[PDB]
Amino acid sequence: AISSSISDILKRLDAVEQEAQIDRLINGRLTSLNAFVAQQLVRSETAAR
Amino acid sequence: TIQKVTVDCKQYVCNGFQKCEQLLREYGQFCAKINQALHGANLMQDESVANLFSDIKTHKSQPLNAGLNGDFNLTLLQVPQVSTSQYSHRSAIEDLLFNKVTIADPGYMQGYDDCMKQGPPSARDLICAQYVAGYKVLPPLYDPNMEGAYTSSLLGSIAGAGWTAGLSSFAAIPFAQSIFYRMNGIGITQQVLSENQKLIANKFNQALGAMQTGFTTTNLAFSKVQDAVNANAQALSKLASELSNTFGAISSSISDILKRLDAVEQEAQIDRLINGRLTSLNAFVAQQLVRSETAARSAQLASDKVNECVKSQSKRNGFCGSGTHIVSFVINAPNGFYFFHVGYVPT
Amino acid sequence: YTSSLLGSIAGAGWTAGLSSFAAIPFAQSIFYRMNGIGITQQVLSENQKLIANKFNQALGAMQTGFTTTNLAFSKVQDAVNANAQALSKLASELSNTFGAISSSISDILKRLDAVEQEAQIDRLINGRLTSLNAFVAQQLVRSETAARSAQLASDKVNECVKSQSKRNGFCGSGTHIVSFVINAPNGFYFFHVGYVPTNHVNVTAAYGLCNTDTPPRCIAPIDGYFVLNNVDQWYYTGSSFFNPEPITMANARYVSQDVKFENLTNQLPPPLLN
Amino acid sequence: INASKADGIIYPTGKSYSNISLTLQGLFPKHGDLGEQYIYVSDYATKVVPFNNGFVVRIGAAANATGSVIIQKTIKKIYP
Amino acid sequence: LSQLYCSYESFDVGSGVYSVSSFEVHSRGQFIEQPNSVECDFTKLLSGTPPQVYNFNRLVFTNCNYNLTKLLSLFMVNEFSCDGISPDAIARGCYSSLTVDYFAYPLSMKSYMQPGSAGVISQYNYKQSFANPTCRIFATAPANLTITKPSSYSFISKCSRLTGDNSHIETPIVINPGEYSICKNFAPNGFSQDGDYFTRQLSQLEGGGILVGVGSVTPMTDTLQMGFIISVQYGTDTNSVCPMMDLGNSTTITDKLGVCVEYNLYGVSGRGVFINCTAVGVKQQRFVYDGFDNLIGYYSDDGNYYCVRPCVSVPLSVVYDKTTNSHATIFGSVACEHITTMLHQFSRTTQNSGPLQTAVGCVIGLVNSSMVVDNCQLPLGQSLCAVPSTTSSQLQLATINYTQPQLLSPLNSSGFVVQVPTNFSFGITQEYIQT
Ligand SMILES: *[C@@H]1O[C@H](CO)[C@@H](O[C@@H]2O[C@H](CO)[C@@H](O)[C@H](O)[C@H]2NC(C)=O)[C@H](O)[C@H]1NC(C)=O
Ligand SMILES: *[C@@H]1O[C@H](CO)[C@@H](O[C@@H]2O[C@H](CO)[C@@H](O)[C@H](O)[C@H]2NC(C)=O)[C@H](O)[C@H]1NC(C)=O
Ligand SMILES: *[C@@H]1O[C@H](CO)[C@@H](O)[C@H](O)[C@H]1NC(C)=O
Ligand SMILES: *[C@@H]1O[C@H](CO)[C@@H](O)[C@H](O)[C@H]1NC(C)=O
Ligand SMILES: *[C@@H]1O[C@H](CO)[C@@H](O)[C@H](O)[C@H]1NC(C)=O
Ligand SMILES: *[C@@H]1O[C@H](CO)[C@@H](O)[C@H](O)[C@H]1NC(C)=O
Ligand SMILES: *[C@@H]1O[C@H](CO)[C@@H](O)[C@H](O)[C@H]1NC(C)=O
Ligand SMILES: *[C@@H]1O[C@H](CO)[C@@H](O)[C@H](O)[C@H]1NC(C)=O
Ligand SMILES: *[C@@H]1O[C@H](CO)[C@@H](O)[C@H](O)[C@H]1NC(C)=O
């Protein structure tokens, strides 16, 4: 996206372009959160053993 | 074990539509790789199960009475009489354990027809959803009868006397005498055993009579059984629910995209769904591999536990329960083994 | 490192193990490991050459297990294939277009203009970073698993190769005698030698024997059974091989009175005479 | 307003659901809101209220009861 | 076997039991229920003088059919810009509602009504909303029609509130997308002169409202030009706005229960299986959805409620034996009757190794022999296996056998009986541990 700040995207763009650029950040953050959860689960199983 | 699941990758990603299918090929041998990884995981699971049941196999046994051996009541640990709740090899306590756990029936024989005939019942069913989404639950290597036979042959194992090696001879020593020897070796003299024979047997029967009461989520092990069941269900839920993620497209339905848009816009919107579904399938495969590795290591641990606590008496503390170990029993549980460690608890 | 283990010297049997170093030859160590599983010295002396021949017969056929029909060899090849699979997944992912016109940055710079070029290169960049993250995560998991397995391999060397194991199933099936470890691709390969009995015989055994005296003295067998044979004479046999021998204090220990013990008045064994 | 009774909820248009729960956004009243009460009189036509998102009316809560006008009988609903 | 060589993609595949990709599903069925809908009313648009841009006329169409081609061929399109839909999909689709904003607009200004524009049209006259699938059209009306021309083109150039004690503070008032300007009431039918700074600027109840009408007497072109803002909605109603069509007779579902059929029921389009069930949900709403907005029910005109099961694919597996080049097919969790009726299977299954019912589902290519095995290499689940035939290369359906343990009888005498070995051998267990 043009930036990683939603405030900048809301500054510089219009409705459709804003929506696409916010969707980029949304999807990226969801994928990274999924990765974080998976690695936490692995680490916690290891720590229990 | 874990539930064995395979995915029809092409049907899962493209849901039948042809434009998606031709667009799917710009990503390498993705569906083939998904299929091969799942196949390898299931193959390793089957080999693990075969090795486990070959390791816990008994080669010599002795007859046991039906209700009382000496003064010990082993009714709950034995396959019942003509009652025979459609397994004929599952014991009474195993029946109770399997009746206290809620498991969705996968319908390994006619589940497709059941899912088409039923209709309404079990809204958001995961077993029925496997035919819409395009994943398949595979049946276990052995049916419950043969696993029940394996774990029921263990109650009458012989293994040789307690003061000897343990896999060279076979001493046909009755159950009561074996228990009394196991108590003699923890520091209880023969005079005490002779004096307190019936008291000891009554306390043992008191202990066995109350192991039904531990089939609650307040108990740790039963809650772990249900946790494993829930993890099995959770994998299928996360697989089936990801098909409604739009990944930033107008819809998550390829029919709607083909309905509302033109060629280039259609192609871009379909690429969105394709990429998202491939990433989610890769994640599913990775977690299934991790879970299967863990389950194989835990199967090795279960074999070790059988050989140390069930077939023999343990001198380690805390390995076969809390206290001074006497004798352990193992039954079949959903996705693994369930143990009953009998220990000497002084007061 | 692994070849130095064959001639390794530790404390003798019947001792602690890491305090002293006993220069006991290999054959004597084998016969002690056999004596401690329930085979008396008389049987070992009689069956010396037979035992050596059977050991040389078992040790001469371990090469025939180097096939994928064998579990352990198949697991070696599985580890090799996993190593190759990581590299193949890493290298094949560079042809993923990730929804761009091509997988080649040269083609994208060839066919498009500035903004479209930047969008397509962004596609390729994002895809490659996600795949690299996945590769790193799976390498971390595999390496942690391999470190735990290396700890297990060290445990197995210490229990099965440098010593005889009394646990059942830790060093293979049967009664453990001796184990050897060699190097394998990405790990260790063990050869566990176990005692596998055949042709058992039914005999009548006694829990113990007792004389008829003021408070009676009673005996129980040591690592064996009090067996009859094949006004009745009792003999001692090892638990791992049938050979009736006279009952002495070398194979009997004094125990307390029991009601399932035999009551002997004739041909009393030497431990039960006053 | 009691959300546990689904007080003043506008049903989804063009579709229906059976035997399931789900979250859903839209225009709803606030739980525990008391609102303004009007009795059918005086002074109502002089007061101008903003409409911002609309409003929901509860009609005939006191019907089949005993009461009287505020400016003795059985109460009835009077359709604002 | 080709589905295997192509689902794992090589000539050389080892022995095993593999899942493979199924075959396509047929869409031949059509269950269509359409009301006898009235025609949509394109008469206020097709007659009279179109308004200006700030006084646009809004048309909402529901529960009717449109002859769009008859309307498309009247006008002369110059520019369109669609977002979330296309004109062809608009011309071929069914919707809950159709919303039209139409007005008179000059072609020279069609960039001032573009997303992100900075002029006075998006500030004070008309801002397009993008909450729904929408599309812009600029078109020219031919003179011979019933549509007449305004005196000129006009717009709002300044809408502002003067606040403060001396009214010395000038603050603009701007419109939200899809709404009208407060300054519309100064000159509803258009400004009469360029620069019509109104003389009194009606004093409102929170300050003084100011309008300027530099929206000129901008000369009317030789041909009238108009702007159209189209928007469509899905799933918001029980009825639909559908194109004029003649679809023959497919109105019955009485004797097509259980087959995968396509459907067009009051606009909603899809495919699935219809099964007569007990009426749930609200009959007035005519559709029952799930939490993900998927149709799983339908109240028919005949009076019956049908569950809408998506038509599914039968799972299929291939047992492969590489040494003897023999193979068999498992239809997992499917009874052989449903297989004998159904299709969506490959060419060689136009078809004594026929449909055999197992505990894992119907199989083709296995001969039932009631044999047993102990170690087998092609397990099928539920203690079933597939054994390569040594002689007929057909795979056989065997079972894994549980060998019983030998019993040693305890004695009735004083002691006990023990089995002591008389020979022995030296076994060797091999173990690999990765480090
Ligand atoms: C809001 O509605 C709920 C449901 O009618 C009320 O809760 C019930 O109250 C009755 C009487 O006290 C109980 O018998 C029920 O068991 C309650 N149901 C539940 C599920 O809580 C609640 O009283 C109302 N709340 C207010 C603030 O009046
Ligand atoms: C939709 O509109 C078109 C155009 O008005 C109609 O097409 C006409 O159909 C009649 C049938 O009697 C022909 O005689 C005309 O020549 C056609 N005109 C053109 C330009 O093709 C069509 O009939 C309308 N459809 C409906 C059912 O309303
Ligand atoms: C043995 O236990 C069962 C239930 O576990 C009981 O029904 C039976 O009466 C018991 N037997 C005796 C002899 O008490
Ligand atoms: C046991 O019996 C056999 C067979 O007669 C005999 O050869 C052997 O000497 C006996 N064992 C003794 C006497 O210890
Ligand atoms: C041995 O003698 C005692 C009596 O002192 C008796 O209790 C016991 O049963 C006898 N044992 C056997 C097995 O003969
Ligand atoms: C409604 O759903 C519940 C589970 O949430 C289920 O137990 C119940 O049987 C369902 N009722 C009907 C009529 O299907
Ligand atoms: C009605 O609206 C017009 C403009 O649309 C406005 O000029 C007029 O003042 C309004 N009516 C009254 C009574 O104010
Ligand atoms: C296979 O053949 C045996 C022969 O008696 C028959 O009993 C059985 O029903 C057949 N089918 C299966 C699935 O075993
Ligand atoms: C030795 O063992 C073999 C088989 O392992 C058997 O055939 C033979 O009879 C045994 N010899 C004796 C003396 O028992």
Short mmCIF file of N, CA, C and O in Angstrom, two decimals, chain C residues 88-98 102-104 124 128 131-132:
data_model
loop_
_atom_site.label_atom_id
_atom_site.label_comp_id
_atom_site.label_asym_id
_atom_site.label_seq_id
_atom_site.Cartn_x
_atom_site.Cartn_y
_atom_site.Cartn_z
N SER C 88 13.59 -28.61 -2.47
CA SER C 88 12.73 -28.61 -3.65
C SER C 88 11.58 -27.63 -3.49
O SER C 88 11.21 -26.94 -4.45
N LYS C 89 10.99 -27.55 -2.30
CA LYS C 89 9.94 -26.57 -2.07
C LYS C 89 10.49 -25.15 -2.12
O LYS C 89 9.81 -24.25 -2.62
N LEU C 90 11.71 -24.94 -1.62
CA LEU C 90 12.31 -23.61 -1.68
C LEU C 90 12.57 -23.18 -3.13
O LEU C 90 12.30 -22.04 -3.51
N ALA C 91 13.11 -24.09 -3.94
CA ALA C 91 13.48 -23.75 -5.31
C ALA C 91 12.29 -23.67 -6.26
O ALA C 91 12.32 -22.88 -7.21
N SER C 92 11.26 -24.48 -6.04
CA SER C 92 10.12 -24.48 -6.96
C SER C 92 9.26 -23.24 -6.80
O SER C 92 8.57 -22.84 -7.75
N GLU C 93 9.28 -22.62 -5.62
CA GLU C 93 8.41 -21.48 -5.34
C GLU C 93 8.79 -20.24 -6.14
O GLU C 93 7.99 -19.30 -6.21
N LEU C 94 9.98 -20.20 -6.74
CA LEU C 94 10.39 -19.04 -7.52
C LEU C 94 9.68 -18.96 -8.86
O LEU C 94 9.79 -17.93 -9.53
N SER C 95 8.98 -20.01 -9.27
CA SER C 95 8.18 -20.00 -10.49
C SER C 95 6.72 -19.67 -10.23
O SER C 95 5.94 -19.61 -11.18
N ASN C 96 6.34 -19.44 -8.98
CA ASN C 96 5.00 -18.98 -8.66
C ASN C 96 4.82 -17.55 -9.15
O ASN C 96 5.57 -16.65 -8.75
N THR C 97 3.82 -17.32 -10.01
CA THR C 97 3.57 -15.97 -10.50
C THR C 97 2.82 -15.12 -9.49
O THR C 97 2.88 -13.89 -9.59
N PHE C 98 2.13 -15.73 -8.54
CA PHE C 98 1.38 -15.02 -7.50
C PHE C 98 0.35 -14.06 -8.10
O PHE C 98 0.01 -13.04 -7.49
N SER C 102 4.01 -12.73 -15.16
CA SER C 102 5.04 -13.75 -15.23
C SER C 102 5.70 -13.88 -13.86
O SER C 102 5.42 -13.13 -12.93
N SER C 103 6.59 -14.87 -13.75
CA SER C 103 7.45 -15.04 -12.59
C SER C 103 8.81 -14.40 -12.77
O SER C 103 9.60 -14.38 -11.83
N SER C 104 9.10 -13.88 -13.96
CA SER C 104 10.38 -13.26 -14.26
C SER C 104 10.25 -11.75 -14.15
O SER C 104 9.38 -11.15 -14.79
N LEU C 124 5.03 -10.14 -6.76
CA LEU C 124 6.08 -11.15 -6.64
C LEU C 124 6.82 -11.03 -5.32
O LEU C 124 7.11 -12.05 -4.66
N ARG C 128 6.95 -13.98 -2.40
CA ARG C 128 8.22 -14.58 -2.04
C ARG C 128 8.54 -14.40 -0.56
O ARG C 128 9.06 -15.32 0.08
N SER C 131 6.42 -16.95 1.39
CA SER C 131 6.96 -18.30 1.27
C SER C 131 8.27 -18.46 2.05
O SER C 131 8.52 -19.51 2.64
N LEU C 132 9.11 -17.42 2.07
CA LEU C 132 10.35 -17.48 2.85
C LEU C 132 10.05 -17.57 4.34
O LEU C 132 10.73 -18.30 5.08
#
